Amino acid sequence: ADESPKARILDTESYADAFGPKAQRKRPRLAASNLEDLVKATNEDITKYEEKQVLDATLGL
Amino acid sequence: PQNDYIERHIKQHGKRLDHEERKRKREARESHKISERAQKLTGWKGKQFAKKRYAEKVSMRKKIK
Amino acid sequence: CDTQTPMHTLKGHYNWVLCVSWSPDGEVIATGSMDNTIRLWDPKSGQCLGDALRGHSKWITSLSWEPIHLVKPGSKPRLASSSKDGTIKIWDTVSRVCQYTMSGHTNSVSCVKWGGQGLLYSGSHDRTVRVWDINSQGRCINILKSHAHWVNHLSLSTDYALRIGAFDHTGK
Amino acid sequence: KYTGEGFVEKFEDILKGFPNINDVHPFHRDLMDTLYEKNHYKISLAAISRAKSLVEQVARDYVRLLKFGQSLFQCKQLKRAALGRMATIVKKLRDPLAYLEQVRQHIGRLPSIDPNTRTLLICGYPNVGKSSFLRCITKSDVDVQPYAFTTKSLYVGHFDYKYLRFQAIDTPGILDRPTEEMNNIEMQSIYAIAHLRSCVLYFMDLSEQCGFTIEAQVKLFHSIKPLFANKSVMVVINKTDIIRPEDLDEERAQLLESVKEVPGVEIMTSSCQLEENVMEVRNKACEKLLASRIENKLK
Amino acid sequence: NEVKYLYLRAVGGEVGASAALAPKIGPLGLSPKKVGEDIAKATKEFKGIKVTVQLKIQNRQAAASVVPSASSLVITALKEPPRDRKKDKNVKHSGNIQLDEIIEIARQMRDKSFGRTLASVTKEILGTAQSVGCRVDFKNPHDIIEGINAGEIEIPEN
Amino acid sequence: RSKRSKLVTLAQTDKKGRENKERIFDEVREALDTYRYVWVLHLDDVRTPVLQEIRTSWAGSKLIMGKRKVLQKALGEKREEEYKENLYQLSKLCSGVTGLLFTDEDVNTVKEYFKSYVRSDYSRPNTKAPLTFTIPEGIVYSRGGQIPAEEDVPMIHSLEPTMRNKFEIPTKIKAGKITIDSPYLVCTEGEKLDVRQALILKQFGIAASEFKVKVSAYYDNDSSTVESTNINME
Amino acid sequence: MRVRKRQSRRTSTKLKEGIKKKASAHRKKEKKMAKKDVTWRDPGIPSNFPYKAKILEEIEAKKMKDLEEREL
RNA sequence: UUCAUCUAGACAGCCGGACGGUGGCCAUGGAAGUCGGAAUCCGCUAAGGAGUGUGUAACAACUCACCGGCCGAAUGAACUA
Numbered sequence A: 001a002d003e004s005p006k007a008r009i010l011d012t013e014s015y016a017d018a019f020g021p022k023a024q025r026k027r028p029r030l031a032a033s034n035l036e037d038l039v040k041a042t043n044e045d046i047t048k049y050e051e052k053q054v055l056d057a058t059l060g061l
Numbered sequence B: 001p002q003n004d005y006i007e008r009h010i011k012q013h014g015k016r017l018d019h020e021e022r023k024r025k026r027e028a029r030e031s032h033k034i035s036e037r038a039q040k041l042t043g044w045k046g047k048q049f050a051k052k053r054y055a056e057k058v059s060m061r062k063k064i065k
Numbered sequence C: 001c002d003t004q005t006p007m008h009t010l011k012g013h014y015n016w017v018l019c020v021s022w023s024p025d026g027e028v029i030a031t032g033s034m035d036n037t038i039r040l041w042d043p044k045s046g047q048c049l050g051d052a053l054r055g056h057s058k059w060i061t062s063l064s065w066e067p068i069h070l071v072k073p074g075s076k077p078r079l080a081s082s083s084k085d086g087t088i089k090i091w092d093t094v095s096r097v098c099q100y101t102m103s104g105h106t107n108s109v110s111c112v113k114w115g116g117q118g119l120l121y122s123g124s125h126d127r128t129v130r131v132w133d134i135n136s137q138g139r140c141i142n143i144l145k146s147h148a149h150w151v152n153h154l155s156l157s158t159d160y161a162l163r164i165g166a167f168d169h170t171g172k
Numbered sequence D: 001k002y003t004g005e006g007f008v009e010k011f012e013d014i015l016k017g018f019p020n021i022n023d024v025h026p027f028h029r030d031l032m033d034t035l036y037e038k039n040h041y042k043i044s045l046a047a048i049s050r051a052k053s054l055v056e057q058v059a060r061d062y063v064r065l066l067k068f069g070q071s072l073f074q075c076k077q078l079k080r081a082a083l084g085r086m087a088t089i090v091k092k093l094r095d096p097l098a099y100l101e102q103v104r105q106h107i108g109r110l111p112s113i114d115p116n117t118r119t120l121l122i123c124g125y126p127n128v129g130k131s132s133f134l135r136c137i138t139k140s141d142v143d144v145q146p147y148a149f150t151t152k153s154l155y156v157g158h159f160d161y162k163y164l165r166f167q168a169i170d171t172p173g174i175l176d177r178p179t180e181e182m183n184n185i186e187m188q189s190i191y192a193i194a195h196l197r198s199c200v201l202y203f204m205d206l207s208e209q210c211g212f213t214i215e216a217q218v219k220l221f222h223s224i225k226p227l228f229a230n231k232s233v234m235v236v237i238n239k240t241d242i243i244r245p246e247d248l249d250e251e252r253a254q255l256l257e258s259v260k261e262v263p264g265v266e267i268m269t270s271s272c273q274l275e276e277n278v279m280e281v282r283n284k285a286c287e288k289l290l291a292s293r294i295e296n297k298l299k
Numbered sequence E: 001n002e003v004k005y006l007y008l009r010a011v012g013g014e015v016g017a018s019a020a021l022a023p024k025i026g027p028l029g030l031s032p033k034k035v036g037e038d039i040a041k042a043t044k045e046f047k048g049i050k051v052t053v054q055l056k057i058q059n060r061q062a063a064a065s066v067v068p069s070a071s072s073l074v075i076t077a078l079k080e081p082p083r084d085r086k087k088d089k090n091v092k093h094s095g096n097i098q099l100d101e102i103i104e105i106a107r108q109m110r111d112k113s114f115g116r117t118l119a120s121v122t123k124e125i126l127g128t129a130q131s132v133g134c135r136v137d138f139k140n141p142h143d144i145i146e147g148i149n150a151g152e153i154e155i156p157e158n
Numbered sequence F: 001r002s003k004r005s006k007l008v009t010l011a012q013t014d015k016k017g018r019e020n021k022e023r024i025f026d027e028v029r030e031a032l033d034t035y036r037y038v039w040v041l042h043l044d045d046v047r048t049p050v051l052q053e054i055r056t057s058w059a060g061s062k063l064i065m066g067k068r069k070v071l072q073k074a075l076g077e078k079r080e081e082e083y084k085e086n087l088y089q090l091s092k093l094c095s096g097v098t099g100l101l102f103t104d105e106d107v108n109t110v111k112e113y114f115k116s117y118v119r120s121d122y123s124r125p126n127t128k129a130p131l132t133f134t135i136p137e138g139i140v141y142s143r144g145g146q147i148p149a150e151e152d153v154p155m156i157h158s159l160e161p162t163m164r165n166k167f168e169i170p171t172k173i174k175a176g177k178i179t180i181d182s183p184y185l186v187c188t189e190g191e192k193l194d195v196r197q198a199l200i201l202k203q204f205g206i207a208a209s210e211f212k213v214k215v216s217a218y219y220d221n222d223s224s225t226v227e228s229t230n231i232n233m234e
Numbered sequence G: 001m002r003v004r005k006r007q008s009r010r011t012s013t014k015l016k017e018g019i020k021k022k023a024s025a026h027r028k029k030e031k032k033m034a035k036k037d038v039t040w041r042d043p044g045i046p047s048n049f050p051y052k053a054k055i056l057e058e059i060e061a062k063k064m065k066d067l068e069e070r071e072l
Numbered sequence H: 001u002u003c004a005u006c007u008a009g010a011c012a013g014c015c016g017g018a019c020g021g022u023g024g025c026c027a028u029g030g031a032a033g034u035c036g037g038a039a040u041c042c043g044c045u046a047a048g049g050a051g052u053g054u055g056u057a058a059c060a061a062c063u064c065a066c067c068g069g070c071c072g073a074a075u076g077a078a079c080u081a
């Protein structure tokens, strides 16, 4: 097989530490490299969301 | 309202004037209420109440130990 | 191994002997145990050199030696040790001291490797790999973060030469 | 069959109610990922779905087995076995159910932000007066306290300018740190700035009552400079009743000119005790946003 | 005039550490930039080490001094290289501090101590050293304490 | 059945027993032989830092506290059970919170220290009011107008039920701040104070009363007689 | 105020005889299990008695006498 | 029934103390006994947890663990029927 299954995140971090009164998560697991890459990714996501919205507005709406 | 608005309201206006006294008297009444429930509940609800009481006593003894 | 018979017994530790290692010049055996201690042994006499190395608050996970080609002549190689407590300790066996105690890992350190370019590579259960500089008072040069789980093991391209030192297959 | 249907309908009520994190708008997706850890979110909902399928399978298998029961004792044993297997499946969901109850309670209180309407975004360092400006221009109940990070989440207010509805977004403060050591609270503001095409108002305190120097504020502005691309930008100097931009140092005036160098920002002075000035700056921000949106629609 | 006393915990050597003093300073009207500069000047000896800073305010002035503390003095005598929050995190304190420097710290902290003996003050400092996790004479600080109790270690001043 | 149930707490400190009283007994009877002057001191409602300051200033002497009955039993209740001659008068002079001061320092020095030693203390119930306190109208501040209100941090909102119920002060919450409609006089100077007034004064932090250690008498080893000191016994 | 149906306490002959048979079967099974199973098989003086010291003195004297009554 | 406490003071109650190094170390925007992770020491004590809970953005404040003052004679716990 060329690819491995995804890592089981529950082994390292539990639901309680993920969110809730006893949550110990304060930073993102994978922070962005820099603000330029962040805004490029968000612009790409906006474009893809608009394309998908048009494609579903063609039929479903 | 947005975010933790009930907590903000408690911070800004407090609670009802007799909240603490009412809560204290209810917690004082809880022992009589538990005894009356044990002697009054019948059937499946009574059996479940007895089973839960046994489990709670076992857990408390384990915590003390 | 010539006669397939026992030769020496080393019974200094108190708990399980988790890891053993031989010096790259072949002079001394270093054993790290479950009792959070490290011991050094002369193999020819089957004897213990001084007292145990102490300071780790958890059991030893891996032992590595300083390479012979980086060790200056007239001195003995140093010993890097990792442990469950998340710290890497460097021991000078000549004076039987601890020189550096690196502590950057937030979790248990899986393994430590003393490379051939004067660096140390540590892998730990905090999903990171820390590259420390021995020449700079044990300051972490780099932090590599690309794994989503515990890094169980790490290996270097020159590990065979680092473990073999100056000896070859002819045993000269 | 009845017990299986009850479990399945509870699971379906759980699964239909919760939003699809991937399907929502990218702003909502990033905000919910910051708040609730999207990986745990999807894993918990998938565990619910798997439990639903397993309960259905157990019900079908044991009804088929009960077709061949030969006595009351055997049929009772088969029914108890089916209910016990369902109960074991449900007991294996203790942690995801608690996580989902907490997430439901938190997500029910999130403010409604339309990422397509007209938006005045407010940003800057802590203790500069963002919440006070939101109080002045809207009727939101955001707290105003003289210590850092009084506000830990996005707050929304509304107003009307030229018969048009505008929303104003107050954000938790941003610190001048790299994104690797940036935390979730600041990531809320970063995502709001990156996603909401709007008019951004960066608030500066020249009196250093905020605990941050003017140089630090200028550095933060130039660091978050790449964020507001293709958006209206404006710099507002708050707390002018304590210190004015006119009687500042020459080096700090050079810093302000460095700020003004970035196109096409404009510098406006204001005080949160000054109704006329806060109304003027609100009107200017609305005018810039309206001009930008209409010029974009005209093409 | 009257003297106002304020106490804070600030990292030694870091400029602009008086940001947390802004709610306190605000009503008095002092300049936070000058307060931070004075704190940085006063904490030049300790670098990368959390210290207790005392500010005295009179008329329109601000003077900064460092109040000695057991953990801060132990960290200073531990002689560790300065660290950065960007680079170094979760740093342990597991070095060695000799008994002579421990006794020096005890002498420094003796003035505001209710112990009647320099031995008692030294045992307090050794308890603090055990808390921070360092070693004394290549031994446990509690082992040094037990040696003092058994009488092997004689504290010089009486 | 039908009994009160005792509350169960999981703490780290266990109760003391008869062994502690035995140790105090033995220490008192050893100090009686070791030292020369035994003073009886009254230290009612003393703060522990103040007591530790007294102990530090009396380096080389001994101050022994504990149960009054235990101390009297150590000194000997009557003449047929006294540890030393004429010690029953000193034993019966104990009253309330009694401290035994064993020393070899001069009587004049001890008297001078205990006449020149005084510390500021919270006003106690059933004591004379050292001042007149009135909370001003408007927002209630933490000091209650003793210092300027601009300097003072406003009173935290969490104490409002305590002020309304326990302190019987009519308070309201406006925008998260404790407020009163009119100024509230709590204590008048030169007037006996009850528990509620003492609690209000302690909550606002007013400390105008003074603590002076009382010296009842002392016993000398060589003379074997008790001499009354009558120090701070007004 | 709607009173429910009360359960009858009139004895049923069939139930009584069946209870007799069930009790006899239970006793037989208990005897069999007690004979079959494998399991390993003097509170002293009560503390509230007043003359415990006298009882203890008497039993000590009896022990001291019986120590030598068999020897000589 | 068996264990414990008790006029060198029983169960309740009220009042006072409840300290010092110390805001112990790491981490946190902030975290000072009380979101967390590991040490959990020493001094002075009558006694006082590197803290049992409420509380704060953090402190503050209250509380109980423990000790003492007033009161003065029995009381508590675990089992069995």
Ligand SMILES: Nc1nc2c(ncn2[C@@H]2O[C@H](COP(=O)(O)OP(=O)(O)O)[C@@H](O)[C@H]2O)c(=O)[nH]1
Pocket: D125, D126, D127, D128, D129, D130, D131, D132, D133, D143, D144, D145, D146, D147, D149, D150, D151, D173, D238, D239, D240, D241, D242, D270, D271, D272, D273
């Ligand atoms: N004099 C003055 N003080 C202000 C002004 N704006 C805010 N403040 C003060 O700044 C403190 C903190 O402001 P805050 O609303 O929390 O700003 P934020 O943290 O950026 O949202 C408050 O105590 C206000 O009294 C202003 O325009 N003038």
Ligand SMILES: [Mg+2]
Pocket: D127, D130, D131, D143, D150, D151, D172
């Ligand atoms: Mg704010």
